[PDB]
């Protein structure tokens, strides 16, 4: 009976801690549902009270506000834009500097989900000062905060070239290249995601990733028996080889051609399409690189794979062959967004 929004919004400004946190619980429970419901909460006028509560000295109300914020930030991009217009980002960064691992993880969740929107929202997060905090958290021994910070960095690097350049300027690349040799498959996946999205930028970013010393690690992982890590390494290598002739030549110098030509004969359709993408991006430049691909034994396997029964693999093999003959690129970005 009755609507729960007016009472919740009014209690958000109440001085009593128990009833105010009860209102916060109601807001979390309401925003955990349909985007129409999240929008109804926003229209109720809760966001200003929540953004002010995010700066509270009480840890309970701070964690509850983080809860509500995540639930709200699991919706449409207009709702995330409303959250940003409320001025909640600096609060999240300061919370990023908090010794409570639970509040820290929740703030990382909120930032990562916020950074899955338009480039303007990524730029707003950057202006809030998140990047240095995330690059510093990249050294944390806590696999949970590390994984969340990697996700956030990947999402920020999934934007325009200027955002990728900001991520690089923060000094993240060496940490990610270090993580490339991690025995933790789960953190490795996110490291490869972040690097792939970084290398989806301009030629300068791809050359920067190359200078960080990543190519040998990826060329070595190309022979991994873990199909997921293999697909991730293929994504990263394709994004690296989507650049200029110098970058493609650096890729070839790392010894990728034999592994790719061998993968051309795999029965896994996902790996087949990914290797075709990689070789297509490779055969998208200098005649030197095309000749290296030819002498690596690719033409024979492509001519054979033009007979594969699957139609997309056939068409993509024909595209790669045409690129290999006729004289001289695709990039892929990925965002992580999670609800709750
Ligand atoms: Ca602690
Ligand atoms: Ca640990
Ligand atoms: Ca392991
Ligand atoms: Ca396997
Ligand atoms: Ca198969």
Residues that place a CB less than 5 A from ion ligand 5: 267
What method was applied to determine this entry? Answer: X-ray
Resolution of the experimental structure, in angstroms: 3.2
Instruction: Give the ligand with the smallest distance to the CA of 147.
Output: 2
Q: Tell me which residue has tokens 């028996």.
A: 225
- Contact yes or no for 103/62 (Cβ under 8 A): yes
Question: Cβ–Cβ contacts within 10 Å for residue 18, how many?
Answer: 9
Compute the distance from residue 146 Cα to the ligand 1 centre, in Å. 15
Compute the distance from residue 61 Cα to the ligand 1 centre, in Å. 17
- How far apart, in whole angstroms, are the C-alpha atoms of residue 153 and residue 132? 11
- How far apart, in whole angstroms, are the C-alpha atoms of residue 143 and residue 94? 21
- How far apart, in whole angstroms, are the C-alpha atoms of residue 174 and residue 183? 17
- Contact yes or no for 340/71 (Cβ under 8 A): yes
Compute the distance from residue 192 Cα to the ligand 3 centre, in Å. 15
- Contact yes or no for 48/13 (Cβ under 8 A): no
Angle (CA) 8 13 14, round 5°: 90
Q: Tell me which residue has tokens 């592994």.
A: 259
- Contact yes or no for 135/143 (Cβ under 8 A): no
- How far apart, in whole angstroms, are the C-alpha atoms of residue 37 and residue 58? 28
- SS3 for the chain is CCCCHHHHHHHCCCCCHHHHHHHHHHHHHHHCCCHHHHHHHHHCCCHHHHHHHCCCCCHHHHHHHHHHHHHHCCCCHHHHHHHHHCCCHHHHHHHHCCCCHHHHHHHHHHHHHHCCCCHHHHHHHHHCCHHHHHHHHCCCCCHHHHHHHHHHHHHHCCCCHHHHHHHHHCCCHHHHHHHCCCCCHHHHHHHHHHHHHHCCCCHHHHHHHHHCCCHHHHHHHCCCCCHHHHHHHHHHHHHHCCCCHHHHHHHHHCCHHHHHHHHCCCCCHHHHHHHHHHHHHHCCCCHHHHHHHHHCCHHHHHHHHCCCCCHHHHHHHHHHHHHHHCCCCCCCCCCCCCCC
- How far apart, in whole angstroms, are the C-alpha atoms of residue 317 and residue 283? 12
* Cα dihedral 124/126/129/134 (nearest 10): 130
- How far apart, in whole angstroms, are the C-alpha atoms of residue 206 and residue 239? 8
End-to-end CA, the chain: 26
Compute the distance from residue 146 Cα to the ligand 2 centre, in Å. 9
């Amino acid at each position: 009976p009755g609507s729960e929004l007016p009472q919740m919004v009014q209690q958000l400004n109440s001085p009593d801690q128990q009833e105010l946190q009860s209102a916060l619980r109601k807001l979390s429970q309401i925003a955990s549902g349909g985007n129409e419901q999240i929008q109804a909460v926003i229209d109720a006028g809760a966001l200003p009270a929540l953004v002010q509560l995010l700066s509270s000295p009480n840890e309970q109300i701070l964690q509850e506000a983080l809860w509500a914020l995540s639930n709200i930030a699991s919706g449409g991009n207009e709702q995330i834009q409303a959250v940003i217009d409320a001025g909640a980002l600096p609060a999240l960064v300061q919370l990023l500097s908090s010794p409570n691992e639970q509040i820290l993880q929740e703030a990382l969740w909120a930032l990562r989900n916020i950074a899955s929107g338009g480039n303007e929202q990524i730029q707003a997060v950057i202006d809030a000062g998140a990047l240095p905090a995330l690059v510093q958290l990249l050294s944390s021994p806590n696999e949970q905060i590390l994984s969340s910070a990697l996700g956030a960095l990947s999402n920020i690097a999934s934007g325009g070239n200027e955002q990728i350049q900001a991520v690089i300027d923060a000094g993240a690349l060496p940490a990610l290249v270090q993580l490339l040799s991690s025995p933790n498959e789960q953190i490795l996946q996110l490291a490869l995601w972040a690097l792939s999205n970084i290398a989806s930028g301009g030629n300068e970013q791809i050359q920067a990733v190359i200078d960080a010393g990543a190519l040998p690690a990826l060329v070595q992982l190309l022979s991994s028996p873990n199909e997921q890590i293999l697909q991730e390494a293929l994504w990263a290598l394709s994004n690296i080889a989507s650049g200029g002739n110098e970058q493609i030549q650096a890729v070839i110098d790392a010894g990728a051609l034999p592994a790719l030509v061998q993968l051309l004969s795999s029965p896994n359709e996902q790996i087949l399409q990914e290797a075709l993408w990689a070789l297509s991006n490779i055969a998208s430049g200098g005649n030197e690189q095309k000749q290296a691909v030819k002498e690596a034994g690719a033409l024979e396997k492509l001519e054979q794979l033009q007979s594969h029964e699957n139609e997309k693999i056939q068409k993509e093999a024909q595209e790669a062959l045409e690129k290999l003959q006729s004289h001289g690129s695709g990039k892929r970005k990925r965002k992580l967004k999670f609800k709750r």
